[PDB]
Write a protein that binds this ligand. Structure first.
Ligand SMILES: C[As](C)(=O)[O-]
Lengths: 306, 306
């Protein structure tokens, strides 16, 4: 584990600032909320302080603080985001919108007193005015995605990528390919993770009281893709219980089958093939494949002996 | 072996009587010939003693003495038919002609002096008037079939079934599904067999000197299915019955194991290795190796497809 992990034991208040320029359109956004890393829960409201948002709100969702992800106990040595605190880290992204323009972003995430703050710059270029983005054709919703993470040892951080699918109004999808890197601000030791991912569920809503153009954003974030030793041990013990049952119930049967069949080494493969064929001609399912496997095994045991 | 087995060491003379009713048409048939169980050979001539046979001769072939089957030496303890002699046995059949009527038959087969006699009653119902049986559309020939035999421990006899394929003159086929049971008449000890079959070749011809409506029937009958390659069909059927149990009993558990384990393609082999290690730490036997293979198989399916 790390020391920064300790800053996230409770609910942490969050502030966000963003300056944006997409195809020459400028805009600013301010955000507030709270993060609860213990339960991988994130609550945010954003207001555009410069008028109407010039791009659809959903395209800013990935841009609008992965240090709040819930890491299971067996994966806590892979939480780079919290290990880099409180000094913080820099988050850089390039987002390619298929058949359209791209965003580039730079963001500083660090503590300021008790508050986690995220200052962001965004420059978008090459967007078609008829396109999904500037044409405002995206639906006000969000799908779940996996955020895949790798260590970037030469840069003392992590490399990240994922592919967002934005629902479009006619029923189609607009892809946004995210390439991301996160670099520590402090000179202290951070944690480099094994490959894993963040599983992310997001929800977009409105504040009925809010006069400005805005977005209410709720996110659930959980680390996964690494399975602990306890689960592997557990599956192993299940298989053993199952294997002992299979053995007690069927071993002598498979043995007498081979006794009657009297295979030699020269006819084993042939016998096996023909047997597999009349078994499977009434159908194939998982258990039948397993019976054929146990038969194959006993067949090999049988020819190997003698 | 048995004592009744010794009644068949040489050539045995055969008499057959049949009284029949199909859809109200009555008729009688008398038959004579010889059986030589030593070489699995059977030679019979039948005369309709009431005029023209109201049904095609091929449909009566199976009804017209399996104690003449050649049982190979390594299988003679599986010969229920001969173990029941001379006291004899009762053979009952229901024969379903697909898309047509059925035959019901009862037959007593026993020695009387030096002669093996077979007395039979046959009743057919629900036969279509223009159909293949009453329309006399079967060809005068016969295919080879296997007669599948299993013990019937509560009835102290055997259960038997098979499916005959009758060639029809227009080029189609008429299936005749046989269900059969054999019950000892005497109180002597009979042989109850393991599962096996009789391979039956038949030929139908005429006597050029016979003016009455008649059939000459030659049959070759040999038992197999106990040892060697002839066991392959049964082993497949066993595996299918077993595979289906394994599937009913464990398919869902293996699925919930893989879902919880969340293997990726990149960690699949490692997870598998670790799983194998905690399984085998309590021991190895055949059933445990089978369970591991079953897990491995479903695992390769899960990752290879995603
Ligand atoms: C499962 As199949 C099409 O080989 O009977």
């Amino acid at each position: 584990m790390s020391k920064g992990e300790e800053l996230f034991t409770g609910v942490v208040p969050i502030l966000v600032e963003l300056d944006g320029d997409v195809n020459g359109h400028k805009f600013s956004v301010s955000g507030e909320g709270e993060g609860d890393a213990t339960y991988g829960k994130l609550t945010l409201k954003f207001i555009c302080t410069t008028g109407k948002l010039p791009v659809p709100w959903p395209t800013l969702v990935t841009t609008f603080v992965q240090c709040f992800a819930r890491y299971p106990d067996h994966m806590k040595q892979h939480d780079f985001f919290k290990s880099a605190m409180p000094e913080g880290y820099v988050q850089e992204r390039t987002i390619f919108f298929k058949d359209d323009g791209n965003y580039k972003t730079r963001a500083e995430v660090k503590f300021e007193g008790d508050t986690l703050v995220n200052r962001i710059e965004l420059k978008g270029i090459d967007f078609k005015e008829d396109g999904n983005i500037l044409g405002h054709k995206l639906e006000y919703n969000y799908n779940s995605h996996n955020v895949y993470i790798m260590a970037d040892k030469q840069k003392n951080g992590i490399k990240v990528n994922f592919k967002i699918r934005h629902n479009i109004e006619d029923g189609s999808v607009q892809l946004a390919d995210h390439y991301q890197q996160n670099t520590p601000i402090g000179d202290g030791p951070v944690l480099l993770p094994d490959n894993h991912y963040l599983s992310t569920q997001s929800n977009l809503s409105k504040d009925p009281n809010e006069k400005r153009d805005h977005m209410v954003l709720l996110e659930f974030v959980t680390a996964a893709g690494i399975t602990g030793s306890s689960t592997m041990g557990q599956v192993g013990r299940q298989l053993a219980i199952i294997g002992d049952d299979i053995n007690r119930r069927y071993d002598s049967e498979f043995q007498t089958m081979l006794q009657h069949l009297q295979p030699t080494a020269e006819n084993a493969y042939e016998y096996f093939t023909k047997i597999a064929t009349s078994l499977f001609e009434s159908g194939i399912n998982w258990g039948r494949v397993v019976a054929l496997l146990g038969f194959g095994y006993r067949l090999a045991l049988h020819v190997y002996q003698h």
